[PDB]
Amino acid sequence: DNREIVMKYIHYKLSQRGYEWDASEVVHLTLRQAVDDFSRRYRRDFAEMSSQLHLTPFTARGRFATVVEELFRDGVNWGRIVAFFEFGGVMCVESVNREMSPLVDNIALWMTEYLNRHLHTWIQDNGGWDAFVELYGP
Numbered sequence: 001d002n003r004e005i006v007m008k009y010i011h012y013k014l015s016q017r018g019y020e021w022d023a024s025e026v027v028h029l030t031l032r033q034a035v036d037d038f039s040r041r042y043r044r045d046f047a048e049m050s051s052q053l054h055l056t057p058f059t060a061r062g063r064f065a066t067v068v069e070e071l072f073r074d075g076v077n078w079g080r081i082v083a084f085f086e087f088g089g090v091m092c093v094e095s096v097n098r099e100m101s102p103l104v105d106n107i108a109l110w111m112t113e114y115l116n117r118h119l120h121t122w123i124q125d126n127g128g129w130d131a132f133v134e135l136y137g138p
């Protein structure tokens, strides 16, 4: 369930920053490992991105859509899906930081929709989430 993967990821990301969120564990565990590694490898770029998110209630949807479209423009791979999760999380953290916490539920929806609509076919073709665990899990 791609929704579950999103919800579990946002709860983990928000927890990292001291915030709670009211709304096969090995997939969730391997994703936490991968997003952590990605965030370390791209720490300073993520600092710049967050400083430039300029989140507003009526621009957030387009900001999300433009970044994720560009991200997967050249094709899909597991690293890009990991980057997708970490971007969404950085947006969720910035929404809470800017007293815009209602946007978190929206981001969770947008992420789940994209996963189910534009990423599921590639995931299923390249082995499923089990292949992600085989490649980068324990």
Ligand SMILES: CC(C)c1ccccc1[C@@H]1CCCN1C1CC2(CCN(c3ccc(C(=O)NS(=O)(=O)c4ccc(NC[C@H]5CC[C@](C)(O)CC5)c([N+](=O)[O-])c4)c(Oc4cnc5[nH]ccc5c4)c3)CC2)C1
Pocket (backbone or CB within 6 Å): 033, 034, 035, 037, 038, 041, 042, 045, 046, 049, 067, 071, 077, 078, 079, 080, 082, 083, 084, 086, 087, 136
């Ligand atoms: C802020 C900015 C940076 C940004 C973020 C999000 C969206 C957009 C952006 C920006 C805005 C405009 C431009 N845009 C950037 C341009 C851009 C640069 C980054 N780029 C990409 C695209 C693909 C890969 C790529 O290597 N894929 S991979 O070969 O499939 C692949 C290789 C390794 C792993 N894990 C290894 C595993 C982890 C867990 C451990 C430690 O326990 C064991 C080892 C995974 N894996 O899925 O786990 C997949 C990549 O490198 C890494 C390097 N190491 C990584 N570790 C986790 C993810 C990951 C990705 C960077 C995508 C394109 C993004």
